[PDB]
C-alpha cells in the first residue's frame, strides 16, 4: 500500500545518482529513496559525509526504500528511456522500468539507514555559488595529502572582518581565496576535509546550481551546506588548529614579473618533461630582455625555452628589474596556481632565490598564492 512509486526524468535521476555515487567513494553503499510531497529524496552517507538531494518527480505513491548505490547507478545510465518508473514491489525488489526493460533490485530495510545528524549551528550565512566555487577552486589543490599532518588535510574556512576566506597549505605553498560578506558574522575557523571540499565543489558547479546561492551552517564539530535549497550536505570537521598563515605572505618584493598566464604554464609544462621524480625543479632565469626556463634530468638530458620581452597580450612578458634573478620551483606548484584562475596575465613578486614567490592575477584581487622556491 504505502509503497514508493514514481515517474522520473531519466537525465535528472542520472545526475543525482552521479553525486550520490561520488560521495561514498562501493558495493556496500546503499542509497535511500524517499518519495513524498511531489519530490524524490535521495540520501547517501558514510562516516564523514551525508548527502540529501531532492528532485521533482511524479509521485504516484509515497514511500521509502533503499538499494545498492552502484547497481542503481549502473542501470539507470544504460536505460534509453527519457522517463523511468520506479516502483517498490516488496519481495520482488525495487522495479526500475522503461518501455521494454525491467530491472528488479533487492531492497534493504530502511530502518538500517541512518537519518542525517541534527546540527545546532553557531554561525549561519549565505553566499553565491559562484563565490563559494571560486574560493574552493583556488584552495583545494594545495591541501596536504600527508594524512599524518591531519590539521592540514583540508581547507581552512574562516572569517576575517567581513571576509569569508578559505586557506590551504602543505608546507611548500599557501593558497588564500576570499569573498566579502554583507552581514556581520561571528568569527569562526574550521577545517573542512579534502573529500568534503571536493564533493561540495562539484555540487555548486552543477549548471542547475552555479547561478544560485549556498547556505552554510556550522559549529565546532560539523558543517552543513544547503545548496540551492534542494541539496544538503553534512560533513564532519577536522579537529585541529590551522597555522597562523598571515606571516607567510611576503609584505615586500624586490622584483616583479608580469607574463601571459597560458604561455607561462605551457612553457613550464614543456620544460618539466625532462625532469625525474624527486628532482622536480625548473629554473627561471629572469631578466628584462628574456626569461629562460630550463631543467635537467639525470641520465635523461636537459631543456631550455626562451621567452622574449613583449607587450603583446598573447605573448606578454615584462620584468622591470635591471638585476637578473635565477630562481627554481617545483613545476607542479606553479602549474597548480596558473590553472586555478582564468586570467590573461599573471603577476609574480620575488625577493631572493630562497624567498617565497607571491603570485597574483591582475583582475582577481581576492586570490593570493605563495610558493616556496627550490635550490637550482
Amino acid at each position: 500500500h504505502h509503497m514508493l512509486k514514481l515517474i522520473v526524468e531519466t537525465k535528472t535521476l542520472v545526475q543525482s545518482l552521479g553525486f550520490a555515487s561520488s560521495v561514498v567513494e562501493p558495493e556496500y553503499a546503499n542509497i535511500k529513496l524517499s518519495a513524498q510531497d511531489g519530490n524524490l529524496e535521495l540520501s547517501s552517507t558514510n562516516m564523514d559525509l551525508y548527502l540529501s538531494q531532492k528532485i521533482a518527480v511524479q509521485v504516484v505513491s509515497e514511500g521509502e526504500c533503499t538499494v545498492s548505490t552502484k547497481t542503481l547507478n549502473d542501470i539507470v545510465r544504460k536505460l534509453p528511456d527519457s522517463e523511468l518508473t520506479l516502483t517498490d514491489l516488496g519481495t520482488t525488489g525495487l522495479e526500475i522500468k522503461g518501455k521494454n526493460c525491467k530491472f528488479n533490485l533487492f531492497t534493504l530495510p530502511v530502518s538500517s539507514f541512518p537519518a542525517m545528524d541534527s546540527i545546532n549551528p553557531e554561525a549561519s550565512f549565505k553566499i553565491s555559488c559562484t563565490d563559494f566555487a571560486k574560493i574552493i577552486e583556488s584552495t583545494k589543490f594545495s591541501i596536504s595529502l600527508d594524512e599524518t599532518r591531519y590539521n592540514l588535510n583540508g581547507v581552512y574556512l574562516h572569517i576575517k572582518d567581513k571576509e569569508f576566506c578559505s586557506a590551504s597549505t602543505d608546507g611548500h605553498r599557501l593558497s588564500i581565496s576570499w569573498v566579502t560578506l554583507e552581514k556581520q558574522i561571528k568569527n569562526f575557523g574550521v577545517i573542512l576535509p579534502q573529500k568534503s571540499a571536493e564533493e561540495i565543489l562539484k555540487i555548486v558547479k552543477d549548471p542547475k546550481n552555479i547561478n544560485e546561492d549556498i547556505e552554510i551552517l556550522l559549529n565546532s564539530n560539523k558543517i552543513k551546506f544547503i545548496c540551492n535549497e534542494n541539496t544538503i550536505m553534512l560533513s564532519k570537521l577536522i579537529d585541529g588548529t590551522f597555522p597562523d598563515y598571515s606571516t607567510f605572505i611576503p609584505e615586500s618584493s624586490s622584483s616583479k614579473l608580469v607574463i601571459n598566464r597560458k604561455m607561462f604554464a605551457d612553457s613550464i609544462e614543456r620544460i618539466a618533461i625532462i625532469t625525474v621524480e624527486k628532482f622536480r625543479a625548473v629554473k627561471l632565469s629572469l631578466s628584462r630582455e628574456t626569461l629562460e626556463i630550463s631543467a635537467v634530468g639525470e641520465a635523461r638530458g636537459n631543456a631550455k625555452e626562451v621567452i622574449n620581452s613583449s607587450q603583446d597580450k598573447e605573448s606578454f612578458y615584462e620584468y622591470n628589474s635591471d638585476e637578473s634573478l635565477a630562481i627554481g620551483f617545483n613545476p607542479q606548484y606553479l602549474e597548480d596556481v596558473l590553472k586555478a584562475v582564468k586570467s590573461d596575465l599573471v603577476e609574480l613578486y620575488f625577493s631572493d632565490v630562497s624567498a617565497p614567490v607571491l603570485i597574483k592575477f591582475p583582475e582577481n584581487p581576492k586570490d593570493i598564492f605563495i610558493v616556496l622556491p627550490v635550490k637550482v
Binding site: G171, H172, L174, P243, F248, P356, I370, L372, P373
Partner: peptide
Amino acid sequence: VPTLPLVPXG
C-alpha cells in the same frame, strides 16, 4: 627544498 615555518614539519 625549504618549507614554510610550520612547526610540526616545516
